[model samples]
Target chain A: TTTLLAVNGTLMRGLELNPNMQKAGGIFVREDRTDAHYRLWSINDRHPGMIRVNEGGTHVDVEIWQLPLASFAALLMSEPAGLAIGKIKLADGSEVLGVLAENWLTEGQREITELGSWRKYTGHFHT
Target chain B: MTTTLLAVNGTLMRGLELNPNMQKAGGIFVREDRTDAHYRLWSINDRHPGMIRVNEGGTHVDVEIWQLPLASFAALLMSEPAGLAIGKIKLADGSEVLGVLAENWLTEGQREITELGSWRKYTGHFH
Candidate 1:
């Protein structure tokens, strides 16, 4: 029920995998439509390693990972507390960072609706 | 407001989602209590596209993802961002994940309350 999001700098193609998902225990769920401002990109080949740089020449790397709906709720409640940092627009319309969660909420119902379980939903477009 | 985080390797509940936050539009938030690190080689019935080789040797993937509060506000704001990813420790640890946006906040008031929106608030974790 929980969905995670990341911002990768590069496209996800031409990467290598030591083992394929067939050997791994997992499923693929894609989003059919995105909000309106973001775009989705993918590569034909798989990538290796945990790190990847953005292709737009920005020195950013991102990856999204998901867990069971129930499990994600547990993480928010049990995970070690770290400094919660986030970037917000200033009154002047500039961007800044700060903490938002001394604690976080991982509700169950909401998670299920946002990320419907189907690859067709995720991999279909770049709206 | 909103936050973003990632679960990695054997810890992230078997390869979840993709995309990072900072560059493509995101930030990081950390927690001090991770409930309990789910060391089991089991996943939440989720994973990535390609494949993975766990350190424990069994093929189960894991990863985590998070989005910003505002551009996450605006990713919630504008732009067509893609799927969000996340992980949880499960019933034992009791974690959770879900969507908290139709629109996120880049509030002028909150933008100030949090450490004056400082970088030091972060980069000071892993405790």
Candidate 2:
């Protein structure tokens, strides 16, 4: 099973690991667009560790800034009911939901499209 | 090289995917005890998505909820310095450091302890 993790805060723009990728046996995926309830910001380089605030008055920050697919899967197995949110639909008619902040379980139909997997989907933009 | 990811928030209690393991190409790992600057709390069912705030007024929460190892590795390769933090010492007398919110790079000395890898280390706590 796949797991979905989300960090609903900062822009993660200049962090040492913001745009970097590491090998963890699975894929790292991100969404450029999310519910308007959240906002992404580009903080000035001057504010090194400062978080960009969201419109909701909540200090905006990045979601699961660091995660490991394997570790995430293990988390689900050990605490089957830890961080679940409701299900959501993707633009492609695919359904998505929250599992842990580090993982998401994708539907079989969506898995087939694995068009690029999660990390690849986001990586495409950088390239 | 491996990467380290860290999330400085919620407890991820009673979520649907806390104690499950999914299949990722590599492995997943987690640390139960983190720095003192962070805190973990268990909230009453009275509040479903309510976050257990920390003493520092830094509303405590769980780290990244969902992550794929593959996706993490990709991020490391793509962005060598984003989200990068300094190195740390493991309780086992090994070294630790931050990479992203999903992955961490263990030193050669520590990798040897990969006796069971990361997920196993934490899962052992559950079983």
Candidate 3:
């Protein structure tokens, strides 16, 4: 069994943790964005933490990856604290399992929602 | 080839409404535990409780640790209530394991049950 995972931070291609994704048997699928009801924050400048909100949120760029159901726990274990896997709303209103930031992780962190994409904030763009 | 350890609170526990899902996943109950003191619990419409780690004014919440087939992890998460995710949970013993956590949005208006700590205790459901 497999599922789609939306990643917005270092797990994206050419980013810091992209290799980790590969090791977890993740295959890059496509680029996408989340629904407008989400906000993004830079957690101590290490990784981006995106959380869903009711208002004042915006679309965030993300990369969709296909992963086997078996690697879910391993992938999660390799992730930094406050980041978790949950159902995420895509721009097209479809729901898929994706990385999310815990509220506590965003506290006192820098809000980067205006940038919309982690690549924009970190300049780690890739084609 | 191996199972993943998951800490669960609320309806996923023994004899609860969502316990059947856990059973279907071949989840093996390991032991009962509680989260670290820096966590809070919220009642989700009295149907389930959502737990979140916080920075201030939090309390330990009751939980049960279970070992589940890695292949069944994604499926189990998909069956959970919206806003719940698998993340690193700090146990009262200072160890961390993949556990169910609630997205901050889910607890916005829910009743705070952090004081009660245990879902069964809050609902008076011992069986």
Q: What is the TM-score of chain A alone in each candidate?
A: 0.24, 0.28, 0.95
lDDT, model 1: 0.25
Best by TM-score: 3
Docking class of 2: incorrect
- By lDDT, is 2 or 3 better? 3
Model 2: per-residue Cα lDDT at residue B21: 28
In model 1, which runs have C-alpha deviations exceeding 4 angstroms? A1-127, B4-22, B29-61, B65-67, B70-92, B98-127
Model 3: chain B TM-score relative to the native chain B: 0.97
Q: What does the lDDT read for residue B93 in candidate 1?
A: 39
What is the per-residue lDDT of model 1 for residues A44-105, given as tens digits with 9 covering 90 to 100?
21111111112211112222333343332333333223212233222233332211221123
Per-residue alpha-carbon lDDT of candidate 2 for residues B55-88, written as tens digits (9 for 90 to 100): 3432222233223353333322222222121112
**Local accuracy of candidate 3 as per-residue lDDT tens digits, B1-127:** 5887999998999999999999999999999998899988999999999998888989988899999988988899999998899989899999999999999899988999988999999999986
lDDT per residue for candidate 1 within B1-127, as digits (tens), equals 3344433321212121223323354444332222123222221122212111112332212323343432233232122121112223222135543222111221112222121111122222121
- Candidate order, lDDT descending: 3, 2, 1
Native interface contact recovery, all models: 0.01, 0.04, 0.83
lDDT of model 1 at position B57:
30
Better of 1 and 3 by lDDT: 3
- Candidate 2 vs candidate 3: the TM-score winner is 3
**Which regions of candidate 3 fall more than 4 Å away from where they truly are?**
none
Q: After superposition, how far is residue A54 of candidate 3 from its true place, in Å?
A: 0.2
Clash tally for model 2 = 106
